[PDB]
Subunit: 182 residues, 3 copies
């Protein structure tokens, strides 16, 4: 009954389409959003659905004062039926592949119950995307079982035109929906 | 004559028992403590032994103004006969495995004279502990020669009950003591 | 006609010789500098050539306000014919090997067009240099095709005397020059 979907934004310029992405899921599922500090540089709070709760790192160090209180990264990991990171920056990709967790989003990933699906939609410039570490990290996510929603060939924020643009919201949406109903 | 023991705390909620941990070593050895910024969220200065000097990242960028001055992370690495990190967060674990050093504790580890013993007592939620990166990183520490003091099955700060709680101070203490006297 | 050389400084105490390093290149090439936040602890702006433009992380989040604006890390990657990091700290070395990018310098590396040469001059204490991760990371840079300019045996900022001091500016300069003219 109304699947819980955790949507997340990383520090990619593509984060400007995050509000719209949340809109694609709202009717179908109960949505909660998580963003990194850098994503707040491209994300516009008012562009998100009003029904969507936005969590930041500060929410981590606030929902807990003394033992016994809830641990947000754990609370969200449990609450969620699925996790979608769109966009996923090269930086966050590398932290995931490195087993690092220095913020709310990465802590959720580090404690992620892999029985639940986790989708990522990478977004970065072509050179960063073509860089060898990208494939290295993607290979790692595959091993973890994370599902990749490949970037498309659009007009990058850097003027040029090539691979690296984030997948379109509709595709991200249908991909997650088709899997769930399977 | 009175071994020098460097005790360290990472950003795990278990850091609340750090003062007590220092107490377990004070009589047997000369103790100096090192903590990460996040550990200061769970650590209570007044709970530590008065004879214990606490070093923070700020102490790094203070003991040095111009060439010729001492480099704290190096000064501590030399001073210490042994290093004990309890608790060791998943984040710090990953930085160690990644050869990273962006703070006092990690810089000490990065420059650690592995002729000297280094013990770690991991502390994190069960899912984070059960996460595949954990084992990956533990494997790396093993190669480096670091000694693992496994977490126990207690009642986590997240309410649930499972593996991931930090080893008890007494065990951490006896483990380090038994090795030394060998 | 006047090759574009991007010179970069990391958080090594050796960064105090960065201004002089820029001077070694100024006559031969058009120089632009990039520095990390920590490098600013050892770098003296007034010691650099006046003709040298210095870029910091803040320049990233300033040259861009809305879509369509230039992305500095990409703009610099394109502009540059070669990249030289001297000094390269153990921390930045590890971020490079980890495919991480959380600042201007690392983002440039992450998006680096490897058709262009990239040289690094590591600088760190002997123990950090002798640490096993160092070799591990150097091995990775080799695979990427990055050219290592080994550290020398001088008197470290830590008083002792051993390997780990940054290569001398003249050598860094001649190394880059000899390659270019080949
Ligand atoms: C204008 C601009 C656009 C950027 N675009 C991207 C991008 O598309 N993908 C990416 O991975 N990083 C991009 N970066 C770099 C990231 O913001 C940077 O690596 C950051 O530390 C990522 O933070 P996060 O890992 O918390 O998301 C951009 C930076 C700026 C200033
Ligand atoms: C209330 C709360 C409790 C936490 N408990 C743990 C824990 O037991 N183990 C862990 O590895 N991280 C834990 N985290 C996440 C870390 O604090 C976070 O990854 C941090 O960046 C670690 O910093 P450090 O690597 O400098 O220690 C907790 C966070 C909060 C807000
Ligand atoms: C006085 C002093 C000197 C340092 N010297 C070095 C050095 O030679 N090499 C190194 O890798 N780190 C050195 N460190 C540690 C780095 O500054 C630290 O790892 C930092 O986070 C690196 O930042 P960066 O990766 O942005 O350059 C030193 C720290 C201090 C306080
Ligand atoms: C930015 C947007 C959403 C505009 O339609 C699209 O181009 C995109 O997703 N691009 C991928 C990231 C990027 O451009 N990076 C640029 C430098 S690292
Ligand atoms: C917190 C304490 C010391 C109370 O006795 C004990 O439960 C413990 O070491 N737990 C391990 C870490 C943890 O609970 N993480 C929770 C979420 S990441
Ligand atoms: C600092 C300088 C430039 C003085 O001539 C020289 O010794 C040097 O490059 N040393 C390498 C780094 C170092 O000393 N690290 C010390 C602790 S991590």
């Amino acid at each position: 009954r109304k699947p819980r979907v955790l949507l997340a934004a990383s520090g990619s310029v593509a984060a400007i389409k995050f509000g719209n992405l949340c809109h694609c899921f709202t009717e179908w599922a109960e949505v909660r959003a998580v963003v990194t500090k850098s994503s707040l540089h491209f994300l516009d709070k008012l562009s998100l659905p009003q029904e969507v709760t936005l969590y930041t790192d500060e929410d981590e160090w606030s929902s807990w004062n003394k033992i016994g209180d809830p641990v947000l990264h754990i609370e969200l990991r449990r609450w969620a039926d699925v996790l979608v990171i769109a966009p996923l920056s090269a930086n966050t990709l590398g932290k995931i592949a490195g087993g690092l967790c220095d913020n709310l989003l990465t802590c959720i990933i580090r404690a992620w119950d892999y029985t639940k699906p986790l989708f990522v939609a990478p977004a970065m410039n072509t050179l960063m995307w073509n860089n060898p570490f990208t494939e290295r990290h993607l290979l790692s996510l595959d091993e973890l079982g994370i599902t990749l929603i490949p970037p498309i060939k659009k007009r990058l924020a850097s003027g040029d035109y090539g691979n690296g643009a984030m997948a379109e919201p509709s595709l991200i949406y249908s991909t997650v929906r088709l899997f769930w109903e399977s």
